[PDB]
Ligand binder design. Structure first.
Ligand code: HEM
Ligand code: HEM
Ligand code: HEM
Ligand code: HEM
Ligand code: HEM
Lengths: 238, 238, 238, 238, 238
C-alpha cells in the first residue's frame, strides 16, 4: 500500500537513472559477482522504508544502456543518497552511469476542463500484466506553448487525450513534472504488454496540435523490460 | 520458409544492431580469438528456433562500424535476450554499439488509396541475387507531415511510388515502423547488386514533395555487404 | 567578512567547475585513496583568502557529475591556478571535467527603471538554510534580444521580476555575466530547501515574454546539494 | 597508367577514409613499428592491380586526423576489402576511423547548357605541382535545391562556374556523387599549391545563389598534404 | 622584427592548436615525466627560424583544454611539420587534440570606406601588457551576409567598428581569414589585462546588425593566459 502511495500520490519525486555495465565486470568471476549482487539487494532493502526502487532491463533494447532504476521518494536528497550509495557498491563501481532525470507528481491541471465522459474515461489507466515493457520519453515544450493561456492549453490537451482514448487500458501512463530539475519539462513513463499498441498511441498523438509544440521529444527514448531486481541482477551474475 | 514468414508477415519486429570491434580485441592471442568466434556461432544457432538473424559486413563501408545484425522476431523480448547473450560472449564484450533501432512490419497505410495498377506494380520487390549490398536509412518526419490529412499524404506517397517505379526489380525494399521504440519514425532497408541504381533511386525521390518533410534522413546511413556470419567473424580471428 | 564580500560585491568572478570520478580510481588501493583525499583538503585550505571555494555534491542528482566547485575570485588568474593545482592532485588526476563556466558580478542594469515597490521587495533574497539544494542554469540570449532597446528590455525584465516575486524568500538567486568568457551569456545560480518552489518559479518565468529570447537554456542544468568538501571526498576513499 | 583512367573516367567510385592513430601506438618498440609500416606499404602494392590508393598527411592540419586515403575502384566491394585488410594490419589495428565517404564520378549534368566559351574554359583543370595541399569538403543540398527545375539549376551552376573561372589553373577539382552511400550528396576534392587562392575561390562561391542551398558544408573540412605513402608512414616508425 | 613581421604582416598563416593531456600521463613516474617535458623547448627553438610559436595555458580556464599554441608561418606546410614533430615528442605523444584552426592575415577589406577619423582611431591596437588573458572566438557568417553587396557590408562593419572604439586601448585584436581551411570563416584573437572590458566589448557588438549574421560564434570560445612554455610544462612535471 505505501508503495501504492508513492506511485499514485502528488508531491512525490520520480527519478530515472540509467547505467551501462563495464566490460571488466563480465571479465570478473561469477562468484564475486553473486556477492556483488547480494550487496545491491541488501542496499535496496535498507532503503525500503524511505524510497521505492523498481528495476528495468534496457540491455538489448536501448542503445548504450543496460539497467534503469525508477526511484520514488518524498525528498530528492533521499534519492541522491541511495544512488550515491548504489554507485559506490562493488557492482556500482563497475557501472558507467548514464542518464538521470527527475520530476514531481502533480494533481492534473487540465482534466477539470474536459467533458464529463472524458473525465470518466480517464479513470482507466492500464491493466493487469506481468513484466511489461516500459518506455520513458523526456519532453521539452517550445516557448510558444507557455505563451498560450490556460484555456488554449486546455483545448489542446483535450485533443491529446481524445487521440489517446483507445489506449487507456492497454498502456499504463504516468507523468512527471521536471522543469528546473534537469533539461526537460516532462518525463513520460509507460508500461505495456503490446508494443505495437504503444507505437499506435504515439502515432495517434503525432497528429494533434500539442505534439507540434515539442522542442525536444525523446533523445533518449528508453525502452526496457520491467522485472524484479533479483532476476535482472542474476543475469548480470552469469 | 518460416524465415520467409518472418521477413514478409505483418506484426514482426525488425531490429538493427550495429557494432564496432574495440582495438583491445586485437591484443588477445589469435587462438583465443578463434575460440571466441566459435562461441558466437553456437549462440546464433541456439536462437534459430525463435528469431531470424542476418549479418552484414559494414567494415570499410560504414564509418566507425564493423558488423550489423538484422534480427526479426515476433516478440521484442526474444531479440532482447539474444542481443544481451551476444553482448555477453567474449567477442561481444569487445564490441561497442554503434546503433540499435527497432520497428514493426505493418500492412500498408497508403497503397489501398493508390490506383489499382500501382497496387499491382508493388507486388514486385527485388530479384534473386547473392551477397548484395545493403543500405539502412533511418527517417524522422516533420510535424507538418503528421498534420496533413490522409488524402494529402496518400497523394504524396503516390508521387514517391511513381518516382521509385523504375527501381522495383533492382532495389529490394523493406519498411519498419519505429515511432515510440527509439528516436526515429521509420527504418528503411534496401538490398541491391548495383549501388549506382540505389544512388539514382534516392536522387529521384529527392525531387518529390514528400522529401522536404524528412526532418532526419540517415545519421547514420549504413552501407554494408550481406555475408554469412562466419566470413565476417573470420576477419577478427586473423 | 571577506567571504560575504566575494559573494555580494560587483566585479567578482564566479567560476563553475564540474567533475566526475573515473572508474580506474576504484582500482587504486584503499588507503592510497584516503591519502589522496587529504591533499585536496589542504590545497583548498591554502587558497582561502585569495579565493572562495564552495563545494556541491552532484553525485546522484546530476548526470555524469560527482562534484561541483563554485569559486569566487577578484582575479580569474587565481581561479585558473587553483583549478589547475586541484586537477593535478592524485585525486584530481582521476577526474574528468563536465563543465567550466565563468561570469562576473555586475550592479543591476534594469532595476533602477522598476517601480519603487518592486525595488523594495527585491531587497529580499533567500533565507537562512543549511545544506540547501543548488541549481545552475546557463543561458544564451538570441540576437533579437540584443537588438531591442533599453526601454523594451527594461519592460521585459520588469515582467520577469513580477512573475518571480512570490519566490523571493524561498529561492536565493545570483546572476553572473558570462558573455565572451565561454559560450553563454549568463550563469544563473539558485539555492532552495524546497525544490517544488524552484520548479514553480521556473514555470512562472516560462510564460513571460523574455523567455522566448533564450536561445539556450541549461545544457547542462546542474542540480546538487551544498556540502562541506570533506564529506564529498570521503565518498571516494571507501 | 590505368591510374589516369581511374582518376578521370565516369562510373568510378572514390572513397575518402580518414584515420587517427591510438596513443598506445607509441608505447610499441621502434622495431615493431618499422615492420608494421612495411606491412601497409606491401598491402597497398598488392592491391595496386585492382584499385588506386593515394595518401595524405592530415596530422597537424586537420583536427583529430593523421592520415587520409583517397581510393578509386570500379566497385565498392573492392574498396571494402582493401580497407578491411588495411584495418586488420598491425598498424591499422591501432587506427581510429575519423571519416568514411563514398561517391561516383559522373559525366557532367549542367555543362552542356553553358556557353561555348565556358565549355572551352572548363577544359583546364589545375596544373603540374608536386605534393600539393588537398582539401575535401562534403556537401548536402537543401530540399529546395532538388525541387528546382533543371533549367534553374543550370543557371545557378553557370553562376557557380563563372565565379570559379579565375581559379581553373591554380586549383584542381574533382566532384563525386555521394547521395545514398553516406549522409551527404557530394564530395568535393581539391588540390592546390596556393592555399590563399583556394580561400579566395571559396569566398567567391559564397556570394553565388547556389551557396545558400547547402544544408551542410564541411563538417569536416579536411585539409592535408599529398605525399608518398612511405613519407607519411616514416613519422610513425620514429 | 622577424617576430613582429609574422605578427603584423599580410599573407601570414595563423594556426590555433589546442591540446588536452591524457589521464594516464600521471600514472607515469615523475622522472619519466620530467625528461618528457624537457624536449619540447628545444623543438620550438629548432623551428625558430621558420615559424613563431606562442603558448597559452588553457588548463583551468577553457573546458577540456590544457594548452594552446598560436603559430605563425608563411607556409602552412611548415606549421604542419612543427605540429606533427611536436605531436611526436614524448610529451606530444600523450596529447589529445581539442581544436585546430587556420587563417590568413589580409589587408583590410572595409576600412578604406570608413570616415577618416575612424581610420585614424584604428591605428591604436591594445597596449604593452605582461601575461595577458587571451580569447579566441571562431566565427561563421550566414549566407545572407555573403549575399549583401560591398556597400552594405561596409556600412555594417562601420557600425561594428563604432561600437568597438571605446575598447581600442584595453583590448588588442587580430583577425584571421579562415574560409576553406576548416569549418569557420574567421578566427578572432584578443589579448587583454581586463576581462570585464573584453566582456563589455562583446556586449556592445551583440547589439550591432552585423551580429545577427553570425551563424556560428564561438564553440569553442577559448580563454587562456599567455605564458612562457616552461610555466605550463612545470605543472605536468609535478
Ligand atoms: C493513453 C495514453 C495517454 C493519455 C490518456 C494521456 C492523457 C494526458 C492528460 C489527461 C494530460 C493532462 C494532465 C493534466 O491535466 O495535468 C496529459 C499530459 C501530457 N501528456 Fe499525455 N496521455 C497519454 C499518452 C501520452 C504520450 C504517449 C505522450 C508522449 C510520449 C504524452 C505526453 C504528455 C505530456 C508531455 C503532457 C504534459 C503536457 C502539459 O501538461 O503541458 N501523453 N496527457
Ligand atoms: C523501389 C523503391 C521504393 C518503392 C517502390 C517505395 C514505395 C513506397 C510505398 C508504396 C510506400 C507506402 C507504404 C504504405 O502504404 O504504408 C513507401 C513508404 C515509405 N518509403 Fe518508400 N519506396 C521506395 C524507396 C524508398 C527509399 C529509397 C526511401 C528512403 C531512403 C523510402 C522511404 C520511405 C519512407 C520513410 C516511407 C514511410 C512514409 C510514411 O508512411 O509516412 N522509400 N514507400
Ligand atoms: C526569485 C527569483 C528571481 C528574481 C527575483 C529575478 C529577478 C531578476 C532581475 C531583477 C533581473 C535584472 C538584473 C539587472 O537589472 O541587471 C534578472 C535578470 C535575469 N534573470 Fe532573473 N530572477 C529570478 C529568477 C530567475 C530564474 C529562475 C532564471 C532562469 C533560470 C532567471 C534568469 C535571469 C536571467 C538570464 C537574467 C539576465 C537577463 C538580462 O540581463 O538580459 N531568473 N532577474
Ligand atoms: C575551379 C573551381 C571550380 C569549378 C571550375 C567548378 C565548376 C563546377 C561545375 C561546372 C559544376 C557542374 C558539374 C556538372 O555539370 O555536373 C560544379 C558542381 C559542383 N561544385 Fe563546383 N566548381 C569549382 C569549385 C567548387 C568549390 C570550391 C566547391 C565547394 C567547396 C564546389 C562545389 C560544387 C558542388 C557541391 C557541385 C555539385 C552541384 C550539383 O551538381 O548539384 N565547387 N562545379
Ligand atoms: C576593439 C575591438 C575591435 C575592433 C576595433 C574591431 C574592428 C574591426 C574592423 C575594422 C573590421 C574590418 C576589417 C576589414 O576591413 O577587413 C573587423 C572585422 C571583423 N571583426 Fe572586429 N573589432 C573589434 C572586436 C571584435 C570582436 C570582439 C569580434 C567578435 C568576437 C569581432 C569580429 C570581427 C569579425 C568576425 C570580422 C570580419 C567580418 C567580415 O570581414 O566579414 N571584432 N573588426
Amino acid at each position: 500500500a505505501d508503495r501504492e502511495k508513492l506511485l499514485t500520490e502528488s508531491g512525490v519525486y520520480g527519478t530515472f537513472a540509467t547505467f551501462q555495465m563495464d566490460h571488466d565486470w563480465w571479465d570478473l568471476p561469477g562468484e564475486s559477482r553473486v556477492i556483488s549482487v547480494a550487496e545491491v539487494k541488501g542496499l535496496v532493502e535498507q532503503w525500503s522504508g524511505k524510497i521505492l526502487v523498481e528495476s528495468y532491463l534496457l540491455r538489448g533494447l536501448s542503445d548504450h544502456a543496460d539497467l534503469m532504476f525508477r526511484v520514488h521518494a518524498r525528498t530528492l536528497s533521499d534519492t541522491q543518497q541511495f544512488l550515491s550509495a548504489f554507485m559506490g557498491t562493488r557492482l556500482g563501481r563497475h557501472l558507467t552511469s548514464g542518464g538521470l532525470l527527475h520530476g514531481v507528481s502533480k494533481k492534473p491541471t487540465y482534466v477539470a476542463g474536459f467533458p464529463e465522459s472524458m473525465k470518466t474515461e480517464l479513470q482507466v489507466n492500464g491493466e493487469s500484466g506481468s513484466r511489461p515493457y516500459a518506455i520513458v520519453i523526456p519532453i521539452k515544450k517550445d516557448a510558444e506553448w507557455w505563451a498560450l493561456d490556460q484555456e488554449a492549453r486546455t483545448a489542446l490537451m483535450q485533443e491529446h487525450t481524445q487521440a489517446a482514448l483507445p489506449y487507456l487500458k492497454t498502456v499504463k501512463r504516468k507523468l512527471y513534472h521536471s522543469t528546473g530539475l534537469d533539461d526537460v519539462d516532462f518525463i513520460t513513463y509507460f508500461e505495456t504488454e503490446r508494443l505495437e499498441d504503444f507505437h499506435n498511441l504515439v502515432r495517434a498523438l503525432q497528429q494533434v496540435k500539442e505534439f507540434r509544440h515539442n522542442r525536444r521529444f525523446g533523445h533518449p527514448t528508453l525502452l526496457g523490460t520491467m522485472s524484479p531486481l533479483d532476476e535482472i541482477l542474476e543475469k548480470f551474475a552469469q
